[PDB]
């Protein structure tokens, strides 16, 4: 299929959550904050 | 503590680094560039310290 497998989707979502801390992580530090 | 220095060595330095188009002051690299970040600030001083008419 065109879309990536489930593992790749999970990794991408985890990376997005780790980077964008506005709606993920313990605290909302910044949009591009490495650590929330 | 640090003190002042005679203007002769400053004149020697500026004469040596008169133009950067040659291979003279090319080694400066980042060190040279660093100062450039604060180039406009000095201009402010040169527009604030400029002499009044009485200041010959």
């Amino acid at each position: 299929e065109v879309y990536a497998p489930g593992l790749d989707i999970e990794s991408s979502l985890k990376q997005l959550a780790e980077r964008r801390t506005d709606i993920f992580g313990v605290e909302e530090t910044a949009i591009g904050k490495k650590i929330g | 503590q640090k003190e002042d220095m005679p203007p002769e060595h400053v004149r020697k330095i500026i004469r040596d680094h008169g133009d950067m188009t040659n291979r003279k002051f090319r080694h400066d690299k980042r060190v040279y560039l660093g100062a450039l970040k604060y180039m406009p600030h000095a201009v402010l001083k040169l527009l604030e310290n400029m002499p009044m008419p009485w200041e010959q």
Binding site: V2, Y3, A4, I9, S12, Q15, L16, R19, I31, G32 | -
Partner: protein, 141 residues
Amino acid sequence: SYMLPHLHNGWQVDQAILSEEDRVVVIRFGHDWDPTCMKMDEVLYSIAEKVKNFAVIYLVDITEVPDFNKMYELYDPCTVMFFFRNKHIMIDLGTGNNNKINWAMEDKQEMVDIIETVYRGARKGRGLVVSPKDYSTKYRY
């Protein structure tokens, strides 16, 4: 939700673009966490199902692959480079930089028309091609 394939390594994107045949490789540079880039990724996902026959979308992260940031001057969000047929195409749409689309398309149909025009131009062999819709104005009024 950004489920399109993404280049984990920079060299992987290079060989992925190289491994193309009669298809257009839309490499979308940027970051998924950006909101405008998120909108662009959503638009690309919407397009992907309809034009998967000849248009393949393959995202990449600037932080993950910074070696290509200076290659094509990647210093804006939402940038898109239609690197097709191993040749960086010249897509002109009434903009100063006629080789980079660095903002999310307002409508999906416009992007589909653009990508099919790019495919036609690439197949014809020309390295440059114009857009039916000029983007010099945003039609704000």
